[PDB]
Amino acid sequence: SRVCQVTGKRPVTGNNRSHALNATKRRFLPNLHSHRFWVESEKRFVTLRVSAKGMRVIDKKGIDTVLAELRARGEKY
Amino acid sequence: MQVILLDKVANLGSLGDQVNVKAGYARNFLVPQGKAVPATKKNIEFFEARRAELEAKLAEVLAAANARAEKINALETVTIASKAGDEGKLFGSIGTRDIADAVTAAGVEVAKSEVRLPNGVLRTTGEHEVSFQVHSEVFAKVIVNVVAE
Amino acid sequence: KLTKRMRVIREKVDATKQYDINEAIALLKELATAKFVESVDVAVNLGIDARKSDQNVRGATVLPHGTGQVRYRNDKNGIIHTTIGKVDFDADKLKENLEALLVALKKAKPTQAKGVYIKKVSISTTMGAGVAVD
Amino acid sequence: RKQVSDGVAHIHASFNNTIVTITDRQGNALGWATAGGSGFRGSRKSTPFAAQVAAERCADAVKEYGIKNLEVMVKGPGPGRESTIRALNAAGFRITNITDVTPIPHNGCRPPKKRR
Amino acid sequence: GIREKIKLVSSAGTGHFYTTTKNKRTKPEKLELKKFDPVVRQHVIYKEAK
RNA sequence: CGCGGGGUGGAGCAGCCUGGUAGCUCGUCGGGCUCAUAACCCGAAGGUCGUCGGUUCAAAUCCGGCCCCCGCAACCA
RNA sequence: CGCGGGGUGGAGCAGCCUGGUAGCUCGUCGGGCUCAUAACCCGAAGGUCGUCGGUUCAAAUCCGGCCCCCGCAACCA
RNA sequence: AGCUUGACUGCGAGCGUGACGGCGCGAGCAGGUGCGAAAGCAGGUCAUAGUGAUCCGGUGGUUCUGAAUGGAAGGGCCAUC
RNA sequence: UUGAGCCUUGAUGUGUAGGAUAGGUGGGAGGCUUUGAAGUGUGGACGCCAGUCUGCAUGGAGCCGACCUUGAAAUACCACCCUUUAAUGUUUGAUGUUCUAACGUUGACCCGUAAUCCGGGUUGCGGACAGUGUCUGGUGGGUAGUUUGACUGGGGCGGUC
RNA sequence: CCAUAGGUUAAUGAGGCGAACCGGGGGAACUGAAACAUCUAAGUACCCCGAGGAAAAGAAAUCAACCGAGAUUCCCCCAG
């Protein structure tokens, strides 16, 4: 499923308003991307399905610290 | 990214400054190689106290050792046996690891990833000047000899 | 290519850091020294449009120290120029008179003029550099 | 500017015109003049006198470069071909060696049947 | 029609205005009439406006 | 309505640029010339260089108002 | 039956639209070139603007009756 | 033909005409104006067609309001597109 | 490399009158020179090619403002800028080329594993392209929702409102 | 190479069902507008996931108003 492994941004639905306000159900998809992250302690690579903003959270927080949060919820990376 | 370095990046690296680089440049290169580290108050504390003292020179002590690795083989002319055909044009297109397993068998304990071949992948037969990578600017030019069997 | 005398004068002036009204009057004596006593001219840069007929600003001012009646009329640039007296006088004399100048300039403030009026007012001596004050 | 010392003049003399250009020894052109741009529209376009002023107006525009000696490579038959070099001799240049580079085929493609 | 409507603005400080039409293609001069002004209650001249 | 820039010899256009320079092609006439229309060439007549006012030693150019025109995008009373 | 368009020298077409001045080509007539005809060169004439009436200072033009020609329509059962 | 701007502002008893919206006439009163010596006349044109309701929005004037207060934006009111 | 803005600084700009390849304006008449001068040698920058400018130097310590014909005064000194422009610093952008770490890999090989899925690891090939999300111009009957008037000697056509 | 992935065994919990209610994730149209596109119908029907006996929300970066009140939830007014 299109779910960011870090932030948990699932696809949300909204409308696709035209000029004449003709609403038509559209869906917003999170900017997901598979990326190979490097964990310093384990000295191995970890590929996660992360959103662009999700990379910044892995950037600001400790990469292993956010990995700690993932195993806290019980989802293997 | 306001990353603080650990090594001598050849263009903006002075071992320890807190320069501003693009996000990709750090997360894909400097970090996974150990050349630098994203500036955190915690590791900066461990920098101007623990790392900037002698840990800074710890990386450079083996750098001088690789300067000797620059000349493990004093002869600088390694002979390798290779099968070929008439008028040059050898049997098979060699690889860089062809040099790796031959030179370590007769001298320099080198690996595949550090030998640089500026002249294609050597399709020409004779004596050519291949280069090694022991440092960022320190280069050794060994002339390997591929002669027809 | 410039000569000796004017060389040190521009070297005495930091062309980017524009000075205060308090000590800029004292900085013109840093420039002036000749066989005859010079006078200070005030080049007032205004942000009005000179191509329009509705923005012709000019008038006369009776300066309390003289040199006195001083007239002025803007050019095809939107910048007007005036002089206020000889530089060999009192420092505070030079201070208070130019203050009355921008008051007189705001006296004839155009109604069709858009934007901040006083752009960059620079005072300068006959044989010295130009110093703009805030 | 570049101040090129030597140069090679080229002359493309056809039956209805002549376009003389002046280039250096490396082939990169540095200016030209035609008999068609010197006025001469029609019958006068294919005349040796028109080839004369073409060599003169090409003697100019190359002044920025000021070339001393000049190699001459004339090409094709026609009304100019000779009055363009004599005019270029008196142009002031130093004609080094004159050659004929006419494109003669060895019975290649077939020429038209036109003209009656 | 092709007769443009104009704005007859007052002369006094008040912004009171009269409104009427005018064929500019025929009469190229501006109107300078005299009409009543209700906020000061007097008769002043009125000038052209768009 | 808001915006952009033009009126230039019988026609269009350049010159508007950073202000002092009315030229080119087709057209009319006369002439040279060929068998001859034409091609070619010389010269002349032909323009308040939109209108008024202002700035200036000088404006068709700069500036303001305006007549008209072509084009652009918008038009949910 | 109705809609739209048209009727202009001898022929074939413009100008009607937004009223005051009718042009292009061929043709016709006179002259020239040629032994002569054609072609070519030069000059000129020729139009009740379908017809009648009205509105208008003025009607080929705006409007209506009528006549002729052309296209469309003339339909569902 | 001379002189001028009543093609005026605030109202308007009493009537006509319409299902209604709405349209039309109007002596007279107050301020002030033009013309005339004066009495008086003028709030368009001999009269009857020349024109569209509302919503929304634009421009100008008016502290009427303006969500804690002082202001402002935005509304209301008037003129007007 | 190449555009643009800007800063410092050096240049840049001949109707005609005329010694002047001078834009307006502007305070005022001394600057200039021995922190090595007028004249000239010579190359260059600019060039409506009229006459500016200029590094080094024999030389050697001078040069010249109102004065004059001008609408103007002399870049002798200096100020704010208009045009044209040059070196530097700086700021980002648009292209070109190379590289490898992101990414792709429906290439070969090895392992999980007797599995042409897949995941991982060597290596090779591309390569910051591609592809994906968000915003956005165009196209869009492929698709969906609908509109498509009334009067009328029945309706349609014509005409009317 | 180490290490992990993978694999075997033991221990514990879960799965399905159930009338309505409850929270969250997706989400119509007929219809009204005397047509219809904004709008309404309605975040209703319906589908899905999860939970309890109730569930939800909940102890103010809440209002109020220059005087004060004090979490949430439900009902009657406020008020068509």
From Swiss-Prot, chain A:
UniProt keywords, alphabetically: Ribonucleoprotein, Ribosomal protein, RNA-binding, rRNA-binding
One cellular component term from this protein's GO annotations in UniProt: cytosolic large ribosomal subunit
Protein family (similarity comment): Belongs to the bacterial ribosomal protein bL28 family.
GO biological process terms on file: cytoplasmic translation; ribosomal large subunit assembly
GTP-binding found in the keyword field: no
Assembly description: Part of the 50S ribosomal subunit.
InterPro entries: Ribosomal_bL28 (IPR026569), Ribosomal_bL28/bL31-like_sf (IPR034704), Ribosomal_bL28_bact-type (IPR001383), Ribosomal_bL28_sf (IPR037147)
Protein name: Large ribosomal subunit protein bL28
NCBIfam families: L28 (TIGR00009)
HAMAP family documented for this protein: Ribosomal_bL28 (MF_00373)
One Gene Ontology term of the molecular function aspect: rRNA binding
Organism expressing this protein natively: Escherichia coli (strain K12)
Swiss-Prot record, chain B:
GO biological process annotation, one example: cytoplasmic translation
UniProt key word Ribonucleoprotein: yes
Annotated organism of origin: Escherichia coli (strain K12)
The protein's assembly and partners: Part of the 50S ribosomal subunit. In stalled/collided disomes (pairs of ribosomes where the leading ribosome is stalled and a second ribosome has collided with it) bL9 in the collided ribosome contacts bS6 and uL2, while it contacts only helices of the 16S rRNA in the stalled ribosome; the inter-ribosome bridge thus formed is different from that formed between normally translating ribosomes.
Family to which the UniProt record says this protein belongs: Belongs to the bacterial ribosomal protein bL9 family.
InterPro entries: Ribosomal_bL9, Ribosomal_bL9/RNase_H1_N, Ribosomal_bL9_bac/chp, Ribosomal_bL9_C, Ribosomal_bL9_C_sf, Ribosomal_bL9_N, Ribosomal_bL9_N_sf
This protein's GO CC annotations: cytoplasm; cytosol; cytosolic large ribosomal subunit
Keyword annotations of the record: Acetylation, Ribonucleoprotein, Ribosomal protein, RNA-binding, rRNA-binding
Modified residues (N6-acetyllysine): 89
Molecular functions (GO terms): large ribosomal subunit rRNA binding; structural constituent of ribosome
Entry function: One of the primary rRNA binding proteins, it binds very close to the 3' end of the 23S rRNA.
Pfam families reported for this sequence: Ribosomal_L9_C, Ribosomal_L9_N
Keyword Ribosomal protein listed: yes
Name this polypeptide is given: Large ribosomal subunit protein bL9
Primary gene name: rplI
TM annotation in the entry: none
Curated annotation (Swiss-Prot), chain C:
Gene3D superfamilies: 3.30.190.20, 3.40.50.790
GO cellular component: cytoplasm; cytosol; cytosolic large ribosomal subunit
One GO biological process term: cytoplasmic translation
InterPro entries, alphabetized: Ribosom_uL1_bac-type, Ribosomal_uL1, Ribosomal_uL1-like, Ribosomal_uL1/biogenesis, Ribosomal_uL1_3-a/b-sand, Ribosomal_uL1_CS
Residues recorded with modification N6-succinyllysine: 95, 106
Recorded superkingdom: Bacteria
Gene Ontology molecular function, alphabetical: rRNA binding; structural constituent of ribosome; tRNA binding
One Pfam family linked to the record: Ribosomal_L1
Record bears the keyword Lipid biosynthesis: no
Keywords assigned by UniProt, alphabetized: Repressor, Ribonucleoprotein, Ribosomal protein, RNA-binding, rRNA-binding, Translation regulation, tRNA-binding
Keyword Ribonucleoprotein: yes
UniProt xrefs under NCBIfam families: rplA_bact
Family: Belongs to the universal ribosomal protein uL1 family.
Subunit structure, interactors included: Part of the 50S ribosomal subunit. Cross-links to the P and E site tRNAs.
The protein's role, per its UniProt record: One of the primary rRNA binding proteins, it binds very close to the 3'-end of the 23S rRNA. Forms part of the L1 stalk. It is often not seen in high-resolution crystal structures, but can be seen in cryo_EM and 3D reconstruction models. These indicate that the distal end of the stalk moves by approximately 20 angstroms. This stalk movement is thought to be coupled to movement of deacylated tRNA into and out of the E site, and thus to participate in tRNA translocation. Contacts the P and E site tRNAs. Protein L1 is also a translational repressor protein, it controls the translation of the L11 operon by binding to its mRNA.
Record-given protein name: Large ribosomal subunit protein uL1
UniProtKB/Swiss-Prot annotation, chain E:
Gene Ontology molecular function: any one: tRNA binding
Annotated keywords: Methylation, Ribonucleoprotein, Ribosomal protein, RNA-binding, tRNA-binding
GO biological process: cytoplasmic translation; response to antibiotic; ribosomal large subunit assembly
Keyword Acetylation found: no
Gene3D superfamilies found in the cross-reference section: Ribosomal protein L33
PANTHER family: 54S RIBOSOMAL PROTEIN L39, MITOCHONDRIAL (PTHR15238), LARGE RIBOSOMAL SUBUNIT PROTEIN BL33M (PTHR15238:SF1)
Protein's UniProt name: Large ribosomal subunit protein bL33
Originating organism: Escherichia coli (strain K12)
